[PDB]
Amino acid sequence: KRFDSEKAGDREVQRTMLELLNQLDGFQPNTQVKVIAATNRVDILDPALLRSGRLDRKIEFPMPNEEARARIMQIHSRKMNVSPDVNYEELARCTDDFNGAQCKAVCVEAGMIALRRGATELTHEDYMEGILEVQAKKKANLQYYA
Amino acid sequence: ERGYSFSLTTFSPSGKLVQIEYALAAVAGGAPSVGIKAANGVVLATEKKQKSILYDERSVHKVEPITKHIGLVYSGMGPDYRVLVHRARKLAQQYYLVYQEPIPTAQLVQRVASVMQEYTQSGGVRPFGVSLLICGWNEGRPYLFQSDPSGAYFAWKATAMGKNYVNGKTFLEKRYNEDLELEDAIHTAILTLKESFEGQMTEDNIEVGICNEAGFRRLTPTEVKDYLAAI
Amino acid sequence: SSAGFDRHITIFSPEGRLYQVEYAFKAINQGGLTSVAVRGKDCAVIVTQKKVPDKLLDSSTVTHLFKITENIGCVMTGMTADSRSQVQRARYEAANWKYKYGYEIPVDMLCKRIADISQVYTQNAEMRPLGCCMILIGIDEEQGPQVYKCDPAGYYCGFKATAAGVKQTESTSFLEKKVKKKFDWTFEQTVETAITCLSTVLSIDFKPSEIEVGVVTVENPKFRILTEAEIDAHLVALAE
Amino acid sequence: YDRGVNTFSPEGRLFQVEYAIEAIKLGSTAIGIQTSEGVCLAVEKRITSPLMEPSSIEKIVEIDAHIGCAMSGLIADAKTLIDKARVETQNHWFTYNETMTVESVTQAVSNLALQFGEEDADPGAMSRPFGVALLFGGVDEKGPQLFHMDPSGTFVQCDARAIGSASEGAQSSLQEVYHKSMTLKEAIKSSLIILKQVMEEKLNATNIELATVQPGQNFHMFTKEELEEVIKDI
Amino acid sequence: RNQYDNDVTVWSPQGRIHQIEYAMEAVKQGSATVGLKSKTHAVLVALKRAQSELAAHQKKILHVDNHIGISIAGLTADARLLCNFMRQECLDSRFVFDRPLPVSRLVSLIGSKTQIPTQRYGRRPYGVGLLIAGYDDMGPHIFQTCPSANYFDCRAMSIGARSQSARTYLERHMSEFMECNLNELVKHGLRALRETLPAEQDLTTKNVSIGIVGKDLEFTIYDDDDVSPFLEGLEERPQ
Amino acid sequence: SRRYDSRTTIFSPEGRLYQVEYAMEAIGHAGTCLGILANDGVLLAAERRNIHKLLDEVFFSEKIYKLNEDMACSVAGITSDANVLTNELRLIAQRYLLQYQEPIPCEQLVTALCDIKQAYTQFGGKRPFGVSLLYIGWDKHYGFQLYQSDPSGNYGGWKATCIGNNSAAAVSMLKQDYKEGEMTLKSALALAIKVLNKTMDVSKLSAEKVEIATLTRENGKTVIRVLKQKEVEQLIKKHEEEEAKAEREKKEKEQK
Amino acid sequence: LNQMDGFDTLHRVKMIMATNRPDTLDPALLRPGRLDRKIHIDLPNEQARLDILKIHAGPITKHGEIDYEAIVKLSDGFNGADLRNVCTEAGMFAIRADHDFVVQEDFMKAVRKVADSKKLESKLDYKPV
Amino acid sequence: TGYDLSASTFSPDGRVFQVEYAMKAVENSSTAIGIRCKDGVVFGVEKLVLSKLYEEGSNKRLFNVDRHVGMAVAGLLADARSLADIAREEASNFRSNFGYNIPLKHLADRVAMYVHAYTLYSAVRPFGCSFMLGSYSVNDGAQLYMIDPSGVSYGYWGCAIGKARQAAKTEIEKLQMKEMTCRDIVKEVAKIIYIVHDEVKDKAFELELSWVGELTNGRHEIVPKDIREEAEKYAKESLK
Amino acid sequence: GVILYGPPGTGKTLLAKAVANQTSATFLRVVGSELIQKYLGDGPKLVRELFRVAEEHAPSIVFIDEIDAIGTKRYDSNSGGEREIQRTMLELLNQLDGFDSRGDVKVIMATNRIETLDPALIRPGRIDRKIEFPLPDEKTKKRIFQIHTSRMTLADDVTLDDLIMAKDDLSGADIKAICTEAGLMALRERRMKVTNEDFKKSKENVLYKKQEGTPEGLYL
Amino acid sequence: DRKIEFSLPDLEGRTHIFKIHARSMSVERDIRFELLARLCPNSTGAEI
Numbered sequence A: 001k002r003f004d005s006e007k008a009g010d011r012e013v014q015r016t017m018l019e020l021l022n023q024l025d026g027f028q029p030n031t032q033v034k035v036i037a038a039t040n041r042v043d044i045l046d047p048a049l050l051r052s053g054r055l056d057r058k059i060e061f062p063m064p065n066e067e068a069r070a071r072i073m074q075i076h077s078r079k080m081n082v083s084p085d086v087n088y089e090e091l092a093r094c095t096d097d098f099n100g101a102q103c104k105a106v107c108v109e110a111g112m113i114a115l116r117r118g119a120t121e122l123t124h125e126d127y128m129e130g131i132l133e134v135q136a137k138k139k140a141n142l143q144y145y146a
Numbered sequence B: 001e002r003g004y005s006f007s008l009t010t011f012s013p014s015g016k017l018v019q020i021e022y023a024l025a026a027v028a029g030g031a032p033s034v035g036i037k038a039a040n041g042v043v044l045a046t047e048k049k050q051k052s053i054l055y056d057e058r059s060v061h062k063v064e065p066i067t068k069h070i071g072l073v074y075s076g077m078g079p080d081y082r083v084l085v086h087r088a089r090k091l092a093q094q095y096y097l098v099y100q101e102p103i104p105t106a107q108l109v110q111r112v113a114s115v116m117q118e119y120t121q122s123g124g125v126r127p128f129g130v131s132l133l134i135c136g137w138n139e140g141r142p143y144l145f146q147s148d149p150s151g152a153y154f155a156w157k158a159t160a161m162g163k164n165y166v167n168g169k170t171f172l173e174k175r176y177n178e179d180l181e182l183e184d185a186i187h188t189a190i191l192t193l194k195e196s197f198e199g200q201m202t203e204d205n206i207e208v209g210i211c212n213e214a215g216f217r218r219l220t221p222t223e224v225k226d227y228l229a230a231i
Numbered sequence C: 001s002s003a004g005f006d007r008h009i010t011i012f013s014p015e016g017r018l019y020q021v022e023y024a025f026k027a028i029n030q031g032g033l034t035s036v037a038v039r040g041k042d043c044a045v046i047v048t049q050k051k052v053p054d055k056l057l058d059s060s061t062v063t064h065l066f067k068i069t070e071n072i073g074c075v076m077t078g079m080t081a082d083s084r085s086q087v088q089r090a091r092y093e094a095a096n097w098k099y100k101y102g103y104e105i106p107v108d109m110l111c112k113r114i115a116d117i118s119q120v121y122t123q124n125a126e127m128r129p130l131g132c133c134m135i136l137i138g139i140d141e142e143q144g145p146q147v148y149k150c151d152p153a154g155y156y157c158g159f160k161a162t163a164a165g166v167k168q169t170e171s172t173s174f175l176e177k178k179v180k181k182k183f184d185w186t187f188e189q190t191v192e193t194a195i196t197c198l199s200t201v202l203s204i205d206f207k208p209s210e211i212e213v214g215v216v217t218v219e220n221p222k223f224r225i226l227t228e229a230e231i232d233a234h235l236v237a238l239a240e
Numbered sequence D: 001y002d003r004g005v006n007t008f009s010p011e012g013r014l015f016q017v018e019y020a021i022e023a024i025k026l027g028s029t030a031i032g033i034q035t036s037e038g039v040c041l042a043v044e045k046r047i048t049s050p051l052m053e054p055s056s057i058e059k060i061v062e063i064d065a066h067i068g069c070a071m072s073g074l075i076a077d078a079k080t081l082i083d084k085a086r087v088e089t090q091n092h093w094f095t096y097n098e099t100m101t102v103e104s105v106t107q108a109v110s111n112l113a114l115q116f117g118e119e120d121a122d123p124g125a126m127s128r129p130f131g132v133a134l135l136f137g138g139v140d141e142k143g144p145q146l147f148h149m150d151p152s153g154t155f156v157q158c159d160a161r162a163i164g165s166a167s168e169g170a171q172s173s174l175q176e177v178y179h180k181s182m183t184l185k186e187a188i189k190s191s192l193i194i195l196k197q198v199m200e201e202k203l204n205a206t207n208i209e210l211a212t213v214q215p216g217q218n219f220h221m222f223t224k225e226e227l228e229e230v231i232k233d234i
Numbered sequence E: 001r002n003q004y005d006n007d008v009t010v011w012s013p014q015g016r017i018h019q020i021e022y023a024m025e026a027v028k029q030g031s032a033t034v035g036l037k038s039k040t041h042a043v044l045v046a047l048k049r050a051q052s053e054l055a056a057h058q059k060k061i062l063h064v065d066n067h068i069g070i071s072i073a074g075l076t077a078d079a080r081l082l083c084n085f086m087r088q089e090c091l092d093s094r095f096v097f098d099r100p101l102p103v104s105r106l107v108s109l110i111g112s113k114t115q116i117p118t119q120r121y122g123r124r125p126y127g128v129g130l131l132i133a134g135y136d137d138m139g140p141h142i143f144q145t146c147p148s149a150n151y152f153d154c155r156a157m158s159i160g161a162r163s164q165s166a167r168t169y170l171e172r173h174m175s176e177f178m179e180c181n182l183n184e185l186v187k188h189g190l191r192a193l194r195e196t197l198p199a200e201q202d203l204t205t206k207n208v209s210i211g212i213v214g215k216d217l218e219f220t221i222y223d224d225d226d227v228s229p230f231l232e233g234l235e236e237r238p239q
Numbered sequence F: 001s002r003r004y005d006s007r008t009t010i011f012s013p014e015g016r017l018y019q020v021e022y023a024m025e026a027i028g029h030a031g032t033c034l035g036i037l038a039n040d041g042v043l044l045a046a047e048r049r050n051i052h053k054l055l056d057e058v059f060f061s062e063k064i065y066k067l068n069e070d071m072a073c074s075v076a077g078i079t080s081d082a083n084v085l086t087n088e089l090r091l092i093a094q095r096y097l098l099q100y101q102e103p104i105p106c107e108q109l110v111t112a113l114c115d116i117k118q119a120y121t122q123f124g125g126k127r128p129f130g131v132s133l134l135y136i137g138w139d140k141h142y143g144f145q146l147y148q149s150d151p152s153g154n155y156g157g158w159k160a161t162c163i164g165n166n167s168a169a170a171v172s173m174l175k176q177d178y179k180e181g182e183m184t185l186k187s188a189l190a191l192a193i194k195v196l197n198k199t200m201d202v203s204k205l206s207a208e209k210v211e212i213a214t215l216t217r218e219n220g221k222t223v224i225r226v227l228k229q230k231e232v233e234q235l236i237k238k239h240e241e242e243e244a245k246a247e248r249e250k251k252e253k254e255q256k
Numbered sequence G: 001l002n003q004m005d006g007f008d009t010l011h012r013v014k015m016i017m018a019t020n021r022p023d024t025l026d027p028a029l030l031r032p033g034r035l036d037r038k039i040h041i042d043l044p045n046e047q048a049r050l051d052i053l054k055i056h057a058g059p060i061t062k063h064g065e066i067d068y069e070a071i072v073k074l075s076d077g078f079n080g081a082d083l084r085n086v087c088t089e090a091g092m093f094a095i096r097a098d099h100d101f102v103v104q105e106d107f108m109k110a111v112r113k114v115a116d117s118k119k120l121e122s123k124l125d126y127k128p129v
Numbered sequence H: 001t002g003y004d005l006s007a008s009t010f011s012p013d014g015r016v017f018q019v020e021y022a023m024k025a026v027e028n029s030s031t032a033i034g035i036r037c038k039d040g041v042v043f044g045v046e047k048l049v050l051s052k053l054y055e056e057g058s059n060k061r062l063f064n065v066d067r068h069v070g071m072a073v074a075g076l077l078a079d080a081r082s083l084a085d086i087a088r089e090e091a092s093n094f095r096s097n098f099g100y101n102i103p104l105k106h107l108a109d110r111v112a113m114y115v116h117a118y119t120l121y122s123a124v125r126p127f128g129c130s131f132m133l134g135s136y137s138v139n140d141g142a143q144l145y146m147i148d149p150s151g152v153s154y155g156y157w158g159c160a161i162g163k164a165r166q167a168a169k170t171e172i173e174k175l176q177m178k179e180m181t182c183r184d185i186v187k188e189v190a191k192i193i194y195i196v197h198d199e200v201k202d203k204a205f206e207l208e209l210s211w212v213g214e215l216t217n218g219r220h221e222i223v224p225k226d227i228r229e230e231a232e233k234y235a236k237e238s239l240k
Numbered sequence I: 001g002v003i004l005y006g007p008p009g010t011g012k013t014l015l016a017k018a019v020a021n022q023t024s025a026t027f028l029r030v031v032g033s034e035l036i037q038k039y040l041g042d043g044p045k046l047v048r049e050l051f052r053v054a055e056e057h058a059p060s061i062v063f064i065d066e067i068d069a070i071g072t073k074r075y076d077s078n079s080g081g082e083r084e085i086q087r088t089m090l091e092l093l094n095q096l097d098g099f100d101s102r103g104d105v106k107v108i109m110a111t112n113r114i115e116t117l118d119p120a121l122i123r124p125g126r127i128d129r130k131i132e133f134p135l136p137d138e139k140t141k142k143r144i145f146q147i148h149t150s151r152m153t154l155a156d157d158v159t160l161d162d163l164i165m166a167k168d169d170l171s172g173a174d175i176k177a178i179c180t181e182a183g184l185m186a187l188r189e190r191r192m193k194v195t196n197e198d199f200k201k202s203k204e205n206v207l208y209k210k211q212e213g214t215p216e217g218l219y220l
Numbered sequence J: 001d002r003k004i005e006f007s008l009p010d011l012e013g014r015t016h017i018f019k020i021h022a023r024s025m026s027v028e029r030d031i032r033f034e035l036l037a038r039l040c041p042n043s044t045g046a047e048i
């Protein structure tokens, strides 16, 4: 976001941004170049990026809800030898506030736990121990509950 | 409700109250005013500059009376002025209910100063942003006091307040002296308000309230109209 | 040029200004509407455009022309919820005055009570300063029509003709030139000036279904809200 | 950086009661052993200087005539809890003509263990949790019962619990030497054997005080010069 | 540097209150309880836990009235406070109207009670979760309360740490819950509860408790003495 | 809410109170007052911070505040914040006179106002009272007393005091130039004039920047007097001649 | 600044310059003589958004039922370019199920999609000159 | 950054970010649709289950304030229940101290002020609920009002509140609600709900409907369960 | 590593100058006031170049005087140079012992305070010899006065024992401040060598310089 | 992908760090290290 500030670090970036905006849309329009932009925050971007031909569509990417999470683990475990008594809905129900990368890290961690005990095909408890590692829960001492 | 009840006016490490100085700087960017006590009565003058000709000048007022012999003008913020005017009126009525005598101006000044002090000290509220100028002819001798937003008060023969007040103070020290009359005090108050006013000076711009031994009187536009000519 | 908590709570800046009322003014022109009040010789008129962007929305409950008392009318600008809270507070204070002091409350005293209520909001540091505007019209015997405008900062003042909302500067710039030649300000002249002010500021030539006009006068002191037939008549009389 | 007294952790447990749990092991140790013929208590006085009179420091404070207690932590905080427990026992005796069970007085003293508040009212309500763990022992109606209370208000029945600085060491040394079928003298000897290596000072008849509650004897005995009978055997 | 997640008053840019989710994380740290019902009975079976080798197990089920019985998972002081509120409300209902309180208006009362602290300043959410079984005039009910004050009219559900296996078992063995008697229903409850445990130890008749309410049966709690008629006749763990 | 709190109760990492000291630094400038007694009669000397020419001066009062038949008080620091304290101690004295039907002793009034000042630093969350004042009085038990005070509620009896501007040199000269039990009420006034010549940087001070108020005792009256400007001028002149007298010792000796 | 007026004056040379923030420019740049007239371009009004939409919906093979008045009503604070995106997005919904002709329901649907996106970039309102 | 913490803190742009975050929490719920007609008001709520977590009728979002007033909520739950008991208390107080039934406009205004009393101070947080209020009386016709968490109440001939709101108001705009009766607008509401719901991401949808009107002679009640509610079969017939 | 701490003025650095004459290798002195930079980046570069020069030369000794000015705490983490100081100390923490610890380089650090220090510095492996500097009451104060008055005259009337007899709260910086100023009255008055009243008024004025305006009438 | 944590050892690892750090010494074969690890409850490898 361009504002009133000091130094030369921001002013060089704003110089390159104003070069980017004119060469993308405005004088000499071009069809033959298609631009794709990605970010993780949008509150920082300048409103001149949300103009006519700069950024045409604004696309959301929410966190996976239930069936997307069961779909992710099915895709990543395609190469792995999986024992055919595992139901992914129970995993997707237990795994909460995850993403695509975290559900990917569950499958890789589960396959190693079978390698630690040397078993080839997986099991349900291989996945659950992968779940407990991914959550990264610190030492608790929470034995004064319930 | 919330009920903060914590005081947010605290001492600086240099040993001063920063909010009091900020309120005094708010006062110094206010409307100009002058007050002259000269040997028969007190004259208070100020400036009403509207941003447009569509305003009604006679609707709101700035030389607001309190009793039949006590007057008040201000320099600062307008919304923070009607509140202490109403408080001073109610307090003077309580004094008249108890003691059955018109309230002397000095006691009014100490009690509004104590009100300003307890607004500074108490919890969850900001200090006031208005310097007062209280005039009155009680027991023969005229009185003119000024109370700052710190909650203190002084006594002045002739003082000025608001924007460009140090040169007005030098004007009042140089041109005026110890003994005047009422009419030439009105003349020099109009002059020292004219030292920082606009090109025109009519009764629609300036507002003058005088006091004497016959009671407090806010001047009509006719009296200020013929006073503003050739002065 | 802040002092840590200068942005958030209502306190004095080092420059002397208190910033929360200045950030609350933007709530008046955030809403996107403009309202003009014009006072003449024997009438006071209020004109406000209304926005109905969806056909399923009821068009009879959009109007900001609120009724305070049977001879005292008002209009709003800014956030609608704070405007309705001020409407209910003004109705309660008018009824309280009519119960207490026996006679009908004048317009300026109601505006003083509203301003004194709004001053405590900027005095203390625990409440939002309630960013909505106030325009009141009425008739007072041996004073004629009266029009007043209060403020979220608590500053009330009398007026001859004024506007509030988003387009205050251009409307006042046109209105000063309109009022500078003091002509015969009758009823038709006042409604023509009030309509043409918004017609020249916005340059839209509005249909009669999107303009609300409130009237008060000396011939009858009752507050009236003009229906579409008289707005039709005034708009076809305006077009020569 | 600074949060309120009622704030939950990101992992979900709490943010102030766990700090009161963390303040338990800055105090002295206290061992309570329940046996089918009586409940025995023991504590470390933790003297600092020879000029301090050792009989002033007390940890075993009686609540009712048949109920004892033992402290670990900040004694001044637990004085209010013990006074309140005395008030509840006398009120229940006055309104029901019978003695309290030790579970009921532990419940009554644990109800107000977690009642701190900032938005709350009253004439200065508690602003922080109490930093003590209390052991209660008694013979109410089912015989010998021993209870342990921690600053989260959780009370449980324990057969042989030790609290304080070396609570885990005394517990792990209490695991092997215990059984349900033992006697009171064996319990006192075993508790003193455990308390031998826990303390950083040398044991004598003035560094500890112990108390035994039995169905026969009303209050708890074994003051000074009665401790010397079992000290010389150790 | 974290911001927005130190008080219940502050919202989030994503539009949620993180303190309520922290209270959910608190309530999922307790031991697993299972509550289920038939056409004529309501049984909740809870698993006790041991804080030490020789310390006794903390009980979970505790009776509220002649027909309402609640379970618990989470804290204990707030549990006693809420349970005292249920007891006082049931006493006022039996004192004024001389009738049993229905469980639906009781949990509506506790929802209105628990929603007040999660709106004001400096008041924490209640970190407890209840499973409420009750036989009022029209059918038995088993209800589940949350620290978000969203009560759900469940039919067979489990709460606590590692309750997903119990939920999947109750899903796959749902339909044959109303046609069976109490003896088979209790065995179904223990079969649902034993999936929470790891496959090394079992229900050793000292860490379980069973509470039953019914049409003509008083709300009874069995722990370590009347439990043993229910543990016999149970199949071994398939591992 | 809670982040807006100014935290005027907690100690500092060295363990000493952190807000009262800023009030004491505020007392440390903006004013000058002192009091002297060693026999009958006790005097107060004060300095006018504002000597602007447009002041009326007809207020017939100064920092010297009368509060009883047999007392006086002089304030220092914030002038706005001293009216509350003077009214409170006047109320305390009148409540004692209503209760016991005798005039209040000095110790009880000073301790009562110091407890009231301490109550704000103990709790309440408000800012402390930024006023340190100084009492003179007469009593049945101990005669003429002079009492100092602090914003923290600390107090103490004194015979030569220090409350105002830069005055460590004034404390040193009060130590060096003081007599014990021989101070009749004509040498103490000259001592006060000699001190206030040196504390203030204005050389050859006039009767506009000095205020002298004496509490003496008549035959059962306890006359509290504020000295007019007609006698303060020649009281200053009687010390102004003393410098020229003292410079003559180095003039008639250097002759060989 | 120097070659704008300087010593050698210009003849038949006109310079046009445009920006988004006029407040951050130099006062010596913005003084008259070098920039004689400042031209303000604002957000379009109701009839201004109407004939912009008439131009952009020109080469669209629409079915002859389209009413632009309802479309312009649910667009306040739009730029002069989001209406071009509205005309673009209506053909995208025509591309869905290859409906060829553009129906006014797609215009009402595409307007609500664009006004959904116009909530994460605002508060521009820069001071004139 | 720091303006979005408390409700009593104005942004530099003049906004109050806490009620905006409340609206963000509002739009994550499921869709609730209310259509006004010439003879009554029909509600419709798309209830969502996960595996069961419910019986038939559990987590009900159709409340009942009074005999003639219907309430359908969409937002963060347990505040809907609090507002339901609040509106019940206002209705009972009006019946006790004024005799006759509470009008819908007055009740919506009262609950709107109760909602607005929470977005002023810093102690309390704004609500996360946006409900509906529909009623039918012989002397007042059929009315429907919608209240947002900011505290603004407007009348509507048809509106939708929830996640799929912008994809549902167009389907309401397709039909002409000024002329149909209740018996076809229930199946139109079911068709709108079936169209607007996505089955790829949730697949656990279930309708619930409601009724005020002359068919339910001025009383609020649920559509008669297994009798009727074949509008789901009609909407499955309108799958394309 | 050796760290020297104490009350402000006791022996701190002084002792450090006295050890830099009996040493055999070269001695490098740096000051913590120098260890800030207004340019973002020259901070850790100067620390790195300081130890690189010292390592290649000899078995040298690096003395970071006033190291407590930078490495005090890290809990603030607020934007600006106040967090850049935390960044410029982390390189010093890594270059002290973070990978392949350098041979024959001996560090010595002088602080004024203890508790406002980063505990990752306080742990062993970087500094071990924690040295405490107390203020001597009277015994070495005779020898400090013996040293400071050695290279000057002294008369029979002036004796220094009574000037320190009742006082037990001075420091070695103040004693030199006494002795330098007590020679300054004799030069400014063109008087004799030393008088007893030269020492009397030097003690009073140095007390005014050390303790001037601390607001403690209430004894905490 | 892994968050490997460290902490204040145990009781046994202090004895192991003693046996691997103090093995390069000229000490008679009579020192017991488990008592020395008992006497220092909470320590790092750097302290050893």
Ligand SMILES: Nc1ncnc2c1ncn2[C@@H]1O[C@H](COP(=O)(O)OP(=O)(O)O)[C@@H](O)[C@H]1O
Pocket: I008, I009, I010, I011, I012, I013, I014, I015, I144, I147, I171, I172, I173, I174, I176
């Ligand atoms: N025991 C002593 N012998 C001689 N001089 C000393 C002694 N103690 C302190 N000093 C003097 O005090 C001064 C302060 O030394 P030091 O504490 O290292 O400096 P700083 O106070 O600036 O850190 C030195 O200049 C030294 O001459």
